Amino acid sequence: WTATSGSCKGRCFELQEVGPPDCRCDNLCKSYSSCCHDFDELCLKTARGWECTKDRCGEVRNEENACHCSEDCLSRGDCCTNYQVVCKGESHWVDDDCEEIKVPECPAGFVRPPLIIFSVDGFRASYMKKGSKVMPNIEKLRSCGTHAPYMRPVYPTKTFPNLYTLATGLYPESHGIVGNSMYDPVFDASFHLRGREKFNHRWWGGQPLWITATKQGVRAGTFFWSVSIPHERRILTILQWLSLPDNERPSVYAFYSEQPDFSGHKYGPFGPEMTNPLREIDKTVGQLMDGLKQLRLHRCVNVIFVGDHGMEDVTCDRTEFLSNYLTNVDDITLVPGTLGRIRAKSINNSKYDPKTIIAALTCKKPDQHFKPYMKQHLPKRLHYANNRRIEDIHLLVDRRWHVARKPLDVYKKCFFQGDHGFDNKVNSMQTVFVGYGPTFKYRTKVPPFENIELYNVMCDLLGLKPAPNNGTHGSLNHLLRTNTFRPTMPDEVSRPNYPGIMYLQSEFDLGCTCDDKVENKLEELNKRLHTKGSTKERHLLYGRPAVLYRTSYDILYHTDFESGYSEIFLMPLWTSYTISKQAEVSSIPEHLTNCVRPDVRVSPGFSQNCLAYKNDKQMSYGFLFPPYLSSSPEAKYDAFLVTNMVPMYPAFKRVWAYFQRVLVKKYASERNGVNVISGPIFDYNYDGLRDTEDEIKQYVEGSSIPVPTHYYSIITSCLDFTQPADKCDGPLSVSSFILPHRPDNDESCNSSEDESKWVEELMKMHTARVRDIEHLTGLDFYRKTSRSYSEILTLKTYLHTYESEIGG
Numbered sequence: 112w113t114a115t116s117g118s119c120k121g122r123c124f125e126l127q128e129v130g131p132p133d134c135r136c137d138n139l140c141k142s143y144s145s146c147c148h149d150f151d152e153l154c155l156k157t158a159r160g161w162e163c164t165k166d167r168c169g170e171v172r173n174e175e176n177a178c179h180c181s182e183d184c185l186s187r188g189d190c191c192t193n194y195q196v197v198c199k200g201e202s203h204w205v206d207d208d209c210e211e212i213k214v215p216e217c218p219a220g221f222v223r224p225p226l227i228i229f230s231v232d233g234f235r236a237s238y239m240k241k242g243s244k245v246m247p248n249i250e251k252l253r254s255c256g257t258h259a260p261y262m263r264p265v266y267p268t269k270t271f272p273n274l275y276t277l278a279t280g281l282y283p284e285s286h287g288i289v290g291n292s293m294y295d296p297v298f299d300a301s302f303h304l305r306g307r308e309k310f311n312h313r314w315w316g317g318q319p320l321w322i323t324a325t326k327q328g329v330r331a332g333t334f335f336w337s338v339s340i341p342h343e344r345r346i347l348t349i350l351q352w353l354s355l356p357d358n359e360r361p362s363v364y365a366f367y368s369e370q371p372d373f374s375g376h377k378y379g380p381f382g383p384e385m386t387n388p389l390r391e392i393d394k395t396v397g398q399l400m401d402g403l404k405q406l407r408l409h410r411c412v413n414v415i416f417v418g419d420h421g422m423e424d425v426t427c428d429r430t431e432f433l434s435n436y437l438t439n440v441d442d443i444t445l446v447p448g449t450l451g452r453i454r455a456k457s458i459n460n461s462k463y464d465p466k467t468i469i470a471a472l473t474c475k476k477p478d479q480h481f482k483p484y485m486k487q488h489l490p491k492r493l494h495y496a497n498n499r500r501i502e503d504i505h506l507l508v509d510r511r512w513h514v515a516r517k518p519l520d521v522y523k524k525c526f527f528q529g530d531h532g533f534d535n536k537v538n539s540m541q542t543v544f545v546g547y548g549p550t551f552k553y554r555t556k557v558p559p560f561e562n563i564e565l566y567n568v569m570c571d572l573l574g575l576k577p578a579p580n581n582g583t584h585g586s587l588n589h590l591l592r593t594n595t596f597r598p599t600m601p602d603e604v605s606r607p608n609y610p611g612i613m614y615l616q617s618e619f620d621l622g623c624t625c626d627d628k629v630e631n632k633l634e635e636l637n638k639r640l641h642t643k644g645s646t647k648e649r650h651l652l653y654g655r656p657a658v659l660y661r662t663s664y665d666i667l668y669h670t671d672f673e674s675g676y677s678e679i680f681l682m683p684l685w686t687s688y689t690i691s692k693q694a695e696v697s698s699i700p701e702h703l704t705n706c707v708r709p710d711v712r713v714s715p716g717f718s719q720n721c722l723a724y725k726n727d728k729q730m731s732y733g734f735l736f737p738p739y740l741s742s743s744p745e746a747k748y749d750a751f752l753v754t755n756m757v758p759m760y761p762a763f764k765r766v767w768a769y770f771q772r773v774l775v776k777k778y779a780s781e782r783n784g785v786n787v788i789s790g791p792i793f794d795y796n797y798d799g800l801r802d803t804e805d806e807i808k809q810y811v812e813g814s815s816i817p818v819p820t821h822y823y824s825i826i827t828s829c830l831d832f833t834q835p836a837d838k839c840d841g842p843l844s845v846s847s848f849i850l851p852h853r854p855d856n857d858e859s860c861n862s863s864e865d866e867s868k869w870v871e872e873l874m875k876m877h878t879a880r881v882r883d884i885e886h887l888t889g890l891d892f893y894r895k896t897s898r899s900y901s902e903i904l905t906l907k908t909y910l911h912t913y914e915s916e917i918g919g
């Protein structure tokens with residue numbers, strides 16, 4: 112109930128919303144059916160439109176008008192945005208040359224530069240180039256301020272998850288808005304785009320920017336606008352709020368446009384009908400900037416122009432139907448479209464079986480346009496699993512396609528030529544970022560970055576301390592002229608031991624054997640030096656990683672590699688080695704095929720054993736430093752140390768062996784040397800975070816050897832590839848991956864072919880940021896470089912995506 116007979120007189124677009132049943136006058140009252148009877152009349156005036164004309168100049172104030180051209184309008188804060196252009200001989204903001212804003216130029220009484228977030232739904236990154244002729248205001252913001260060629264959204268690349276990620280710096284799995292449509296089994300409630308349930312606060316986790324600001328004493332405009340409030344009125348409302356007295360005036364504001372997404376759905380991303388929506392958004396930007404210039408604020412406010420996701424060509428005839436795969440289609444509920452989420456239709460049905468559902472969906476048709484996953488098997492870079500609202504079964508849908516349950520769902524629920532929601536690495540899903548103002552850099556291009564990073568910078572712009580989030584604070588310092596955040600490196604928690612020779616060979620009873628009993632003063636001075644770390648500067652290029660949790664581990668040096676060996680997990684946490692462009696690949700000699708060697712530095716009790724691998728009929732083993740890349744026949748024996756061994760399913764060894772034998776050498780060839788750091792990851796509860804020992808769900812049969820869920824590698828070299836990886840004077844270049852450690856290769860439909868047709872493709876799908884690996888291992892990399900820490904934070908957030916050129 113709302114007692115809608117109160118009045119909006121002097122309350123139009125009030126900043127604190129009043130409680131029911133009193134009637135509201137704020138920018139969301141419409142969406143709630145709760146505006147006072149006179150809201151339209153008083154607050155949504157339209158008379159005479161949005162522009163001053165010659166004949167209205169100096170007019171007598173008529174309060175009925177949408178906006179004003181009377182002499183008092185500047186004092187009242189309610190002129191039309193073009194008032195000074197028409198009536199006072201001023202130029203439009205877009206017609207002025209740009210001039211560096213070295214310092215904020217603000218009216219007296221402004222305590223900080225205000226921030227205006229101008230968000231545009233469905234604004235695909237390539238619109239900046241492709242629509243440049245029709246967006247002169249946007250193009251000026253872009254070329255005069257700071258811009259990225261594109262900004263990466265979060266998965267799924269839908270509206271609500273991305274706008275709330277923008278607001279919180281959180282992955283959807285953490286903020287809770289995991290799609291545009293959701294079922295929460297604990298609430299037993301459903302969230303939808305249409306309806307009242309989405310207004311309930313229990314869906315919305317984390318701490319959005321307006322709440323962060325309010326708690327710290329920074330006033331915020333209300334971010335959200337009812338659909339029927341026209342854009343011109345949203346702008347006038349922001350401009351009026353900016354004329355409030357100092358103690359009442361917000362410091363942060365948001366404008367939101369439903370375009371170009373709304374048209375892109377109907378006409379496709381580049382439909383000829385798309386030019387007009389782009390022209391119109393640009394005109395709205397022009398209105399804002401002209402209005403700021405009127406208020407003397409155009410060299411005072413920081414403006415962020417930011418999209419939520421792009422838009423792909425998608426039509427009705429490109430739909431896959433689950434009814435073509437499953438017999439039991441009525442026992443499932445599907446969340447359909449550009450991603451698929453599957454759960455049982457009834458929880459009283461104990462015949463429903465996910466394992467058979469996935470098997471029925473796996474590599475069934477030669478051209479299949481979706482791939483099924485258990486959510487914990489999705490590429491870790493998507494961070495899409497740790498939420499009870501995310502169903503166990505997920506379908507990753509190919510770009511340009513839909514999935515639906517039955518054909519009737521499509522013609523009785525073509526109507527659309529665009530959609531989005533696909534894997535956030537897809538070129539068509541990328542979106543835009545521009546920052547313009549005193550706090551942003553002048554005419555500066557910055558590399559692509561992820562939208563999870565923005566909340567931190569928005570907090571920096573407003574002098575706020577961010578709530579805990581998934582950005583890496585400092586990684587976007589290069590966007591800013593001032594207000595940079597100066598982070599310190601995390602403190603190392605555990606210091607390593609450096610064991611020397613402490614055990615005789617006969618003390619080990621591991622059931623291992625090696626044919627290594629054939630063998631100076633020359634190269635035994637040498638072998639001792641190597642075990643003392645004489646070659647460590649070659650293989651450990653950026654310092655040892657820091658261990659940021661409490662544990663017990665040893666540093667082990669060798670001719671060709673260095674490792675941090677965990678006495679708790681019985682294997683390295685990391686293994687570091689450098690492969691120069693000149694290095695050669697050799698084979699494993701026949702007599703060394705099954706060779707495993709006790710490590711006389713490490714006790715039997717802290718060592719793996721070969722008998723466990725013999726008894727475990729599912730599990731085999733691999734090595735972290737590859738024997739194929741040994742520098743000499745004698746160095747090769749080090750690669751067979753029991754301390755370099757890790758458990759591997761035979762199906763996974765196909766992947767790993769090909770990476771080690773073929774791909775590392777290929778990368779060293781292409782990149783002029785690479786430094787490699789590899790190791791295991793344990794994430795049995797799929798939360799993106801390093802497991803403690805008591806979370807491990809699987810061991811090598813009969814032993815305490817824990818089985819990794821994933822294996823990572825971080826592959827670094829010189830950004831200037833004219834320099835070798837081990838002699839690099841400047842910025843670095845990195846690519847990384849987190850490969851799932853699976854007992855089958857069902858994920859790769861071509862896996863019965865040669866590894867040369869499918870392995871590298873798998874690896875690319877599981878591309879990762881160094882930061883993702885840090886969360887998963889509790890390690891901190893790049894501790895000792897000659898680079899600034901902010902530059903290193905940027906490198907750690909980099910994602911190598913393997914898409915071709917944006918725009919093309």
Ligand SMILES: *[C@@H]1O[C@H](CO)[C@@H](O[C@@H]2O[C@H](CO)[C@@H](O[C@@H]3O[C@H](CO[C@H]4O[C@H](CO[C@H]5O[C@H](CO)[C@@H](O)[C@H](O)[C@@H]5O)[C@@H](O)[C@H](O[C@H]5O[C@H](CO)[C@@H](O)[C@H](O)[C@@H]5O[C@H]5O[C@H](CO)[C@@H](O)[C@H](O)[C@@H]5O)[C@@H]4O)[C@@H](O)[C@H](O[C@H]4O[C@H](CO)[C@@H](O)[C@H](O)[C@@H]4O[C@H]4O[C@H](CO)[C@@H](O)[C@H](O)[C@@H]4O)[C@@H]3O)[C@H](O)[C@H]2NC(C)=O)[C@H](O)[C@H]1NC(C)=O
Nearest residue numbers: 284285286287315316317497498499579580581798799886
């Ligand atoms: C991305 O970034 C985010 C943010 O940094 C990372 O996510 C954080 O990660 C932490 C570790 O997993 C986790 O810590 C938890 O916190 C538990 C309490 O959590 C509640 O309170 C949070 C605080 O809100 C307040 O914030 C400020 C202060 O900062 C205050 O001023 C305000 O007043 C706020 O109220 C709150 O954020 C959190 O929200 C979640 O839950 C809500 C509904 O469930 C949702 O609305 C919301 O969306 C959040 O949902 C996510 O997170 C939960 C887990 O919290 C997850 O289940 C969901 O799927 C979803 O992903 C809460 O309301 C605290 O109890 C935990 O401590 C337990 O665990 C350890 C384990 O040993 C012990 O230390 C401890 O003893 C305790 O165990 C006991 O309890 C268990 C019962 O469950 C039991 O098993 C055990 O036996 C014991 O009895 C732990 O510290 C953060 O909550 C989490 N934050 C967020 C926002 O998600 C994320 O990791 C990053 N991702 C990556 C890859 O890096």
Ligand SMILES: CCCCCn1c(C)cc(=O)n2cc(-c3ccc(Cl)cc3)nc12
Nearest residue numbers: 228271274275277278334335336365367
């Ligand atoms: C935020 C959760 C999703 C709500 C989407 N939504 C709608 C529909 C209207 C509207 O006016 N806005 C404005 C914003 C928004 C979100 C984040 C930032 Cl930083 C700034 C503005 N979102 C909406």
Ligand SMILES: [Ca+2]
Nearest residue numbers: 232233270419
């Ligand atoms: Ca959207």
Ligand SMILES: [Ca+2]
Nearest residue numbers: 724727730731
């Ligand atoms: Ca075995």
Ligand SMILES: [Ca+2]
Nearest residue numbers: 794800801802
């Ligand atoms: Ca974990």
Ligand SMILES: [Cl-]
Nearest residue numbers: 269290291292
């Ligand atoms: Cl969804």
Ligand SMILES: [Cl-]
Nearest residue numbers: 762855856862
């Ligand atoms: Cl296989």
Ligand SMILES: [Cl-]
Nearest residue numbers: 237538917918
């Ligand atoms: Cl593109």
Ligand code: NA
Nearest residue numbers: 269270271372
């Ligand atoms: Na949307």
Ligand SMILES: [Zn+2]
Nearest residue numbers: 233270372376
């Ligand atoms: Zn859309």
